[PDB]
Design goal:
Blueprint lengths: L5 E5 L4 E6 L4 H6 L1 E3 L10 E5 L21 E5 L3 E14 L14 E7 L8 E14 L2 H4 L4
Parallel strand pairs: 2-3, 4-7
Antiparallel strand pairs: 1-2, 1-5, 3-4, 5-6, 6-8, 7-8
């Protein structure tokens, strides 16, 4: 009953998760939560956060293995938005500007803890630039199966 609004896939690290609205603890434990109220796929800077791991095991920790040039795809089941990773950084939690819209860019920004340890102050940031928007047909949706 979290009601996913989409899905994210990063084939390079075998990540496939629901996208959920907002950063509730439940959302962050189940998938990628939207970091801003008003963001839209394929527009501005689409920001998503998830826990590094849960009780069960890994969640967003595979971000640590994502490299520049990797593709990240999201869908709302209407269109598929494919982004190409332009940076991966470990930053301090205070660097909130990473999720801000950037004039003349269409970005995705993925955020998780730098580690599972108590009171971790650092975050893994994976950011990418929109490469394509395609109709959510069988061919383009396959990667989300």
């Amino acid at each position: 009953n979290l009601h996913p609004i989409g899905k994210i896939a990063i084939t390079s690290v075998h990540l496939k998760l629901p996208i959920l609205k907002g950063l509730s603890n439940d959302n962050l434990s189940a998938g990628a939560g939207t970091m801003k109220a008003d963001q839209k796929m394929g527009e501005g800077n689409y920001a998503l956060a998830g826990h590094y791991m849960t009780n069960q095991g890994i969640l967003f920790s595979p971000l640590k293995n994502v490299q520049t040039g990797d593709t990240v795809a999201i869908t709302n089941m209407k269109k598929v938005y494919t982004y190409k990773v332009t940076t991966k950084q470990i930053v301090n939690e205070t660097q909130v500007q990473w999720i801000d819209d950037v004039a003349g860019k269409k970005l995705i920004t993925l955020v998780t803890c730098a580690s599972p340890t108590e009171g971790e102050v650092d975050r893994i940031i994976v950011q990418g630039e929109l490469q394509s928007v395609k109709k959510a047909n069988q061919k383009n949706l396959k990667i989300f199966l």
